[PDB]
Design a protein around this ligand. Structure first.
Ligand SMILES: *[C@@H]1O[C@H](CO)[C@@H](O[C@@H]2O[C@H](CO)[C@@H](O[C@@H]3O[C@H](CO)[C@@H](O)[C@H](O)[C@@H]3O)[C@H](O)[C@H]2NC(C)=O)[C@H](O)[C@H]1NC(C)=O
Ligand SMILES: *[C@@H]1O[C@H](CO)[C@@H](O)[C@H](O)[C@H]1NC(C)=O
Ligand SMILES: *[C@H]1O[C@H](CO)[C@@H](O)[C@H](O)[C@@H]1O
Ligand SMILES: *[C@H]1O[C@H](CO)[C@@H](O)[C@H](O)[C@@H]1O
Ligand SMILES: *[C@H]1O[C@H](CO)[C@@H](O)[C@H](O)[C@@H]1O
Ligand SMILES: *[C@H]1O[C@H](CO)[C@@H](O)[C@H](O)[C@@H]1O
Ligand SMILES: *[C@H]1O[C@H](CO)[C@@H](O)[C@H](O)[C@@H]1O
Ligand SMILES: *[C@H]1O[C@H](CO)[C@@H](O)[C@H](O)[C@@H]1O
Ligand SMILES: *[C@H]1O[C@H](CO)[C@@H](O)[C@H](O)[C@@H]1O
Ligand SMILES: *[C@H]1O[C@H](CO)[C@@H](O)[C@H](O)[C@@H]1O
Ligand SMILES: *[C@H]1O[C@H](CO)[C@@H](O)[C@H](O)[C@@H]1O
Ligand SMILES: [Ca+2]
Ligand SMILES: [Ca+2]
Ligand SMILES: [Ca+2]
Ligand SMILES: [Ca+2]
Ligand SMILES: [Ca+2]
Ligand SMILES: [Ca+2]
Ligand SMILES: [Ca+2]
Ligand SMILES: [Ca+2]
Ligand SMILES: [Ca+2]
Ligand SMILES: [Ca+2]
Ligand SMILES: [Ca+2]
Ligand SMILES: [Ca+2]
Ligand SMILES: [Ca+2]
Ligand SMILES: [Ca+2]
Ligand SMILES: [Ca+2]
Ligand SMILES: [Ca+2]
Ligand SMILES: [Ca+2]
Ligand SMILES: [Ca+2]
Ligand SMILES: [Ca+2]
Ligand SMILES: [Ca+2]
Ligand SMILES: [Ca+2]
Ligand SMILES: [Ca+2]
Ligand SMILES: [Ca+2]
Ligand SMILES: [Ca+2]
Lengths: 539, 539
């Protein structure tokens, strides 16, 4: 079957109705009469009675106006029957095609649309795309939409340009900046018919608001800073420096972050950020001493939580920094005494009535150290006497390491220094005595031996001198015990009193001399007890 | 077969070519491949390659612009065959109908055309009809013509009016006159599109020339005429009168015809029309006699060869006529003599030397008959002698009816009258004389009779007088022969000489008297001889 050739009706005909469409006719109309009849969606179906046919002339007619956008075409059947109801001709499948006119204006899905763009973006940066629906016959001039910007606000300079065919808005300058203007509005138009002035149209708004980029570093209020704090302070804020950021406030592009760049090596200072005011609070956390440093110079800088961009302040070093000089003020302190211990050395044979360098107390204000009233405290055998105005020492006794108040060969005396108000230090003074051979080997003199269980005694000398000036000892007999006693010296620190087999139960006496390593003699009278004991207790 | 549904093309398509017309498609295409092809006057016939079909898509296209006025529609055949040569479809009869736009202006067949009408016609008289060719599609606005006169010249009054739809020119007044205006021009316009101002148009001329009708009778130059001709003249023109006709000259409406209305009863005059000058020649054909009438007065009229019309001077009495007075002149004539014979009566016994009224000779100039010199000619026995002046008779001899110069009782004598110049007539005078009884019956005297074969004779008298003064006669005897002779009168002119038986052979003498009807006696002596003869000569 061949496709039917379509007759065409223009939508929105006003009249006069009934309006004429086409004329169907059959050649078999000769010889005998024929009754023309019609049927299809449009006559005996929905929509009803849109068409009808003159029973004789075969002329088709139209009873009402048609909206192409509701009905695009009608597929009908043409008939040729006769009064008797005979049917010479098969039915004619015809179609009536509804043609389109520009009876619809293109409109915008939404009155006002938003787009957003990052500031400082490249020109030709495409920002977005608009689309308008036009219900006319598609892919025809009646539907060919053309876009263009009707007006921009602020009016100049124009930063936007829309491609008329696609509807893409794009940028025209690279100089978009949120800090100069944060939002632009464009009034738009859609004209069908290819944009020719007899086209149908509507307008709409399209607001463009810029998204912020951190293209501005923060900057301090004043060009440079100065302040004051007292020495030996802690947990106190020195100053508050405020800052300016030209970007979006209360955001990582706005919030500041300070850093002490140079000057804070020891850790004396710390800086932090008041979160409610975004200023930098400078505090003292470890104390300063006026005497060591009178002036500290800090260089503090500021940065944003989030990073910098735009490539004008990014390649180049643009953290803005100011130099804050913190002055420390003087407090007149009591006296200090470091190290907590001084030490001086001397010979053990050091004479009395001598002057010796004692504890030096350094006054912090003036290094001369005068104006102080020293004072001894912990002196046992009173070896010393202090100079009240210079803290020097005067020997009273002859010094002597072998004193029963000499542990480790040292003597302890503590001194209290006092200033002209009531403040006081304390120092400890160690007296390290070097040794001299001023003693000789000493021993006990009450010897004791049993009879049938010992033929000897063991006698043990002790040189109170130092290990260098002590043993090895040398033991001599006096010949008072000529050939009734004898002594032998195996080691250099022990000796054994060998009696001879000529003994009585009595108290004999044997004089014995003993020598130190150098040759200092002592003489010792031993009273030996000769008991018939067993153990060294039964006597 | 159902009639094909036509797809439509606008003539004068600008483009863009190739342009899409319609799309042929076959249902049997889902089964196996089909290659579409078309053919008809428009593809492989004339005009060639205007159309073509995409073999697969079935779209028909058009390659060039079409002039509907060259080709009103194209009847094509669409074919759907396959590579294998199968043919699902019989060929599809298509027709591509070319639509018309108003691209032709209606024009006039001839720049200037002529029509003609007779003058003095009724208003609404149809003069002619114009037709313009417009090659556009008939029965549409593109050809719906409206006609109109743009200008008529002479400008006023407008005598013509054209019907805007049909193109028939008509008259508007009845006052058309060729003698006032012979020709009109109409400047015309034809506007298609129903004469609406955006219609196409052209102009033309239409000359109207009036046909002449005889609406003017001819009229004489002079108000009246006078002239002179000679008495007793023949075959000569008396005068030439010219005439005026304001109609079409040298035509049956101009050429004249004269007729004598009154005055020419006897037939003296005849008039005719000179064909070379159209004037009237008045002639004499029977002669005039000055003495009878000195002046004749004629009534002449003139009319046109062709009859009069318009029914204002044709229905109404308008033959113009003039009175011609023709003067007759006197001619000095010879003498005339009518009747050519006179007759006069008299007694036969009329005396000599007597005067009698004779022949009258009429001189025409003066009726006195004087100035005339008469003269006798034919008088035999000289009965008369004529008077030379006037026409009298003088008896010379005594008159006598029984004269031997008188036949039938009349006497002829001719007289010639002569005037004082030399002209002469001739006349005869018959003299019928009355009878008198002056003679008596006379007879011979020589009788003849025989004896034995005759007893009587026969004698016959003759009275020279008239039958009235003659017989019947009466015969008397003198009684000289007492009883020897006797006569009897049977008839009125008979006589028989009866002798008696007492007779002897001798020569007797018998007196016989005889009288006429009235009683005049004569005596005659007969010498009668009676011999014994036999025949009428031998004695
Ligand atoms: C006389 O005064 C001096 C003052 O220093 C005493 O000598 C000091 O002895 C102390 C205790 O032995 C030493 O203290 C240190 O202690 C830590 C742990 O507590 C240990 O790790 C160290 O090795 C050291 O022993 C101190 O260094 C030492 N000072 C000096 C200058 O020698 C001395 O003991 C005093 N005399 C008497 C009789 O107490
Ligand atoms: C219809 O009538 C015509 C008369 O000219 C005739 O030729 C034709 O055959 C008729 N129709 C049929 C189907 O025979
Ligand atoms: C520019 O950018 C917008 C959003 O990225 C697009 O919609 C447009 O087509 C062009 O790429
Ligand atoms: C675009 O402009 C028209 C002006 O004709 C407005 O009516 C419309 O609302 C939109 O602003
Ligand atoms: C688009 O929307 C704006 C409001 O944002 C209107 O002012 C404008 O006329 C258009 O309707
Ligand atoms: C300084 O320091 C000592 C302890 O080392 C105290 O005993 C003295 O009284 C002073 O306060
Ligand atoms: C009037 O009559 C003329 C003939 O005199 C026609 O030619 C014209 O068409 C109209 O009928
Ligand atoms: C009819 O009249 C017009 C005047 O507009 C002429 O131009 C034309 O030639 C025709 O004579
Ligand atoms: C008819 O003819 C005359 C000239 O004879 C033109 O003047 C007129 O315009 C029309 O062509
Ligand atoms: C009168 O006279 C003429 C001559 O003058 C004759 O010819 C005529 O016959 C008549 O006698
Ligand atoms: C009488 O007779 C004569 C001749 O005698 C004629 O000549 C004349 O005319 C008249 O008749
Ligand atoms: Ca619609
Ligand atoms: Ca549209
Ligand atoms: Ca539409
Ligand atoms: Ca920026
Ligand atoms: Ca920014
Ligand atoms: Ca910032
Ligand atoms: Ca200090
Ligand atoms: Ca200080
Ligand atoms: Ca101080
Ligand atoms: Ca010592
Ligand atoms: Ca020692
Ligand atoms: Ca020693
Ligand atoms: Ca054309
Ligand atoms: Ca046309
Ligand atoms: Ca036209
Ligand atoms: Ca006239
Ligand atoms: Ca005339
Ligand atoms: Ca005339
Ligand atoms: Ca005369
Ligand atoms: Ca005369
Ligand atoms: Ca005369
Ligand atoms: Ca006589
Ligand atoms: Ca007589
Ligand atoms: Ca007589």
């Amino acid at each position: 079957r061949w496709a039917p050739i379509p007759a065409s009706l223009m939508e929105n005909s006003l009249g006069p109705f009934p309006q004429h469409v086409q004329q169907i006719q059959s050649d078999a109309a000769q010889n005998y009469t024929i009754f023309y009849s019609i049927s299809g969606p449009g006559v005996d179906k929905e929509p009803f009675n849109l068409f009808y046919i003159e029973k004789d002339t075969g002329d088709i007619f139209c009873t009402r106006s048609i909206d192409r956008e509701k009905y695009e075409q009608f597929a009908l059947y043409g008939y040729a029957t006769t009064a008797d109801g005979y049917a010479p001709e098969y039915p004619l499948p015809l179609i009536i095609k509804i043609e389109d006119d520009n009876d619809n204006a293109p409109y915008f899905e939404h009155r006002v649309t938003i787009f957003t763009v990052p500031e400082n973006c490249r020109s030709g940066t495409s920002v977005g795309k608009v689309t308008a629906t036009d219900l006319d016959e598609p892919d025809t001039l009646h539907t060919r939409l053309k876009y263009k910007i009707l007006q921009q606000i602020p009016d100049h300079p124009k930063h936007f340009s829309i491609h008329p065919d696609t509807g893409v808005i794009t940028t025209t300058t690279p100089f978009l900046d949120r800090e100069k203007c944060d939002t632009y509005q464009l009034i738009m138009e859609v004209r069908d018919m290819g944009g020719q002035p007899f086209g149908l149209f509507n307008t709409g708004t399209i607001t463009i608001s810029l998204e912020d980029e951190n293209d501005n570093p923060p900057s301090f209020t004043e060009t440079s800073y100065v302040t004051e704090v007292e020495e030996n302070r802690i947990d106190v804020e020195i100053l508050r420096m405020k800052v300016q950021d030209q970007d979006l406030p209360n955001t990582p592009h706005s919030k500041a972050v300070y850093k002490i760049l140079q000057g804070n090596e020891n850790g004396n200072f710390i800086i932090s950020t008041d979160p409610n005011t975004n200023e930098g609070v400078l505090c003292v956390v470890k104390p300063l001493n006026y005497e060591v440093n009178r002036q500290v110079i800090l260089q503090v800088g500021v940065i944003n939580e989030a990073q910098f961009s735009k490539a004008a302040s990014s390649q180049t070093p643009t953290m803005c920094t100011t130099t804050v000089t913190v002055k420390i003020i003087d407090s007149d302190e009591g006296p200090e005494c470091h190290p907590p211990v001084k030490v001086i050395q001397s010979q053990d044979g050091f004479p009395a009535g001598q002057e010796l360098l004692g504890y030096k107390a350094l006054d912090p204000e003036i290094s001369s150290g005068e104006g102080l009233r020293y004072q001894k405290l912990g002196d046992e055998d009173n070896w010393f006497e202090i100079n009240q105005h210079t803290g020097d020492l005067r020997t009273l006794k002859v010094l002597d390491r072998e004193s029963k108040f000499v542990k480790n060969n040292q003597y302890n005396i503590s001194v209290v220094a006092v200033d002209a108000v009531g403040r006081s230090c304390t120092g400890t003074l160690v007296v390290h005595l070097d040794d001299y051979n001023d003693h000789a080997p000493q021993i006990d003199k009450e010897v004791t031996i049993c009879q049938n269980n010992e033929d000897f005694a063991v006698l043990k000398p002790v040189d109170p001198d130092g290990p260098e000036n002590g043993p090895p000892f040398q033991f001599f007999l006096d010949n008072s015990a000529s050939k009734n006693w004898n002594i032998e010296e195996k080691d250099g620190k022990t000796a054994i009193l060998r009696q001879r087999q000529n003994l009585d139960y009595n108290y004999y006496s044997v004089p014995i001399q003993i020598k130190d390593r150098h040759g200092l003699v002592a003489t010792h009278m031993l009273t030996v007890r000769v008991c018939d004991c067993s153990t060294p207790s039964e006597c």
